[PDB]
Amino acid sequence: LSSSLKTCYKYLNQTSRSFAAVIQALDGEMRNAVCIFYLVLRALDTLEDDMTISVEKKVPLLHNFHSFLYQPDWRFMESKEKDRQVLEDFPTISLEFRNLAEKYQTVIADICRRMGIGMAEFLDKHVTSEQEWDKYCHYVAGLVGIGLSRLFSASEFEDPLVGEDTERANSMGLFLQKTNIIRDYLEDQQGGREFWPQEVWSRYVKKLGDFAKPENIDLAVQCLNELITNALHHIPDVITYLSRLRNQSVFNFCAIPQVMAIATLAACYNNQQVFKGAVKIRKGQAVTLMMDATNMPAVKAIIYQYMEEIYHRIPDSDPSSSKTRQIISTIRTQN
Numbered sequence: 001l002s003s004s005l006k007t008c009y010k011y012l013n014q015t016s017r018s019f020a021a022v023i024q025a026l027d028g029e030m031r032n033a034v035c036i037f038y039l040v041l042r043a044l045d046t047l048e049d050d051m052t053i054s055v056e057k058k059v060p061l062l063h064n065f066h067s068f069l070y071q072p073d074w075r076f077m078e079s080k081e082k083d084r085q086v087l088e089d090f091p092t093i094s095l096e097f098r099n100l101a102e103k104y105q106t107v108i109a110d111i112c113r114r115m116g117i118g119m120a121e122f123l124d125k126h127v128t129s130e131q132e133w134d135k136y137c138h139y140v141a142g143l144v145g146i147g148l149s150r151l152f153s154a155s156e157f158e159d160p161l162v163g164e165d166t167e168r169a170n171s172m173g174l175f176l177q178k179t180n181i182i183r184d185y186l187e188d189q190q191g192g193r194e195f196w197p198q199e200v201w202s203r204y205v206k207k208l209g210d211f212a213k214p215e216n217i218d219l220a221v222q223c224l225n226e227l228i229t230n231a232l233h234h235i236p237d238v239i240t241y242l243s244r245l246r247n248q249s250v251f252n253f254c255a256i257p258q259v260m261a262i263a264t265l266a267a268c269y270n271n272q273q274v275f276k277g278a279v280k281i282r283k284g285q286a287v288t289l290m291m292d293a294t295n296m297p298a299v300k301a302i303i304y305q306y307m308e309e310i311y312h313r314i315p316d317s318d319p320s321s322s323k324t325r326q327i328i329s330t331i332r333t334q335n
């Protein structure tokens, strides 16, 4: 309806790009509040990811980002990332933030405060333990799930439990984030980034870059399978979370990324190509998943079909093989 809300939607389609439609289908007040939260998170991520901002400048930026939302003039003119426009034109995004109902502004501001604190804490460290991996993912993803869940409840399109059950909402984000991190091993390695947890990879090889060398391919795939097995542990929460949703446009928005991550994990499972390039689901496969993911029985059938596929692919000598079969059995039976 406005001058600067149209530039917000413009930016939404640029950075995204196919997911924009699912956002724009959200009912009523959810559309704008999710769209703006998305753009605000893109701006925060761009700050976190920018290797050219020194840690001494980045830490205050991350800490104070939630406050910049309330500052009509604030902007950042010196970024080398792709989506740098969200930062250059932050005043437009923060204007739209400030036009939201206060019950949505306060969700978004609080999530950005907490994410900024967490992101700042990881600027030095790489992830060590599986517990640190979950803390890192909470900061960059799990709190996104949490924030969205509170927008859904606050709009009254979903029951207050959706917004209050932080652990199910956190699992929603962690599932997607660990899937990306798993899949992105090589491009991350290329770009000097390391997200695989040190406690897990160091049981296989001396350095994380070593999985890209041909002689280590078998150890690399074992570690891949072990991290995939870790990610599958969030699926019972993902099912509980999606089973509670009553709004159709909210259901489709939440279910689409989860079925895509499920299919991605099945594609990556026991797959050497993870260490040679970017394993992706085919466009037509993606489209069909998106169209089908509109009710619980169809989402649960997609999950079970991909889990059975993974199950039948498990090498008996894989060191995680009985952990993999156990979590798959739980997902199936604890229906």
Ligand SMILES: CC(C)(C)CN(C(=O)CCC(=O)N1CCC[C@@H](C(=O)O)C1)c1ccc(Cl)cc1[C@H](O)c1ccccc1Cl
Binding pocket: 016, 017, 018, 019, 034, 037, 038, 041, 140, 141, 144, 145, 148, 172, 173, 176, 177, 253, 254, 255, 256, 257, 260
């Ligand atoms: C935080 C995060 C882990 C990066 C997740 N994440 C994304 O990967 C955004 C991109 C995405 O999901 N695609 C998958 C399906 C279609 C794909 C496409 O066609 O390109 C893109 C994300 C980022 C910001 C927001 Cl506001 C929401 C999300 C999640 O969609 C989400 C949605 C509902 C509930 C919880 C969450 Cl976490």
